[PDB]
């Protein structure tokens, strides 16, 4: 035997929750991804430039 | 012959100068490469 | 006034997911958090090498 | 007489070689630098 009122009132806190938590995660996963990606890019443009200066380094005396 | 003497006025400051932006480009590379870490 | 049953079985079951998206937010809070630390440090050393790139220039 | 054509020859060549010191650091300065301002470019871009 329960608080029926009581696991009713829970029930909905707890779906509120839910809602809220899977939003917060949501948003900040989509925050995380953007920042890989962006990290990735800048690193593959590095890379590149890299080998520009060393090509160029080596061609010099 | 003074020719000679301008057209060498600037070889020894052309040389420090080249010196300078070689390392300058070197320790750059090396930079960029930190940033793979 | 409820299937008293079912509702514990699904209050059991909120607590769960909850636990589970609670910490699922904490740990990527916690490498976005990370994240933007390593980034800001990348800008300040790429500011004092952009600095020492204009003055090398600037002297030449 | 012929020695002062001899050396008239000689300073030519120093004239010759130094001009090719000075366009040969002119032209290693010139992309040196450029490299520089381009990489100080990149540089910059990645802090947007
Ligand atoms: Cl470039
Ligand atoms: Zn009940």
Known sequence: ?61 | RTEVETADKWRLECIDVCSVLTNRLEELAGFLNSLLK
């Open chain 1, 1 to 61: 035997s329960h608080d029926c009122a009581k696991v009713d009132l829970e029930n909905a806190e707890l779906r509120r929750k839910l809602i809220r938590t899977k939003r917060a995660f949501e948003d900040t996963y989509e925050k995380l991804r953007m920042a890989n990606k962006a990290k990735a890019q800048v690193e593959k443009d590095i890379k590149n430039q890299i080998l520009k200066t060393h090509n160029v380094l080596r061609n010099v005396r």
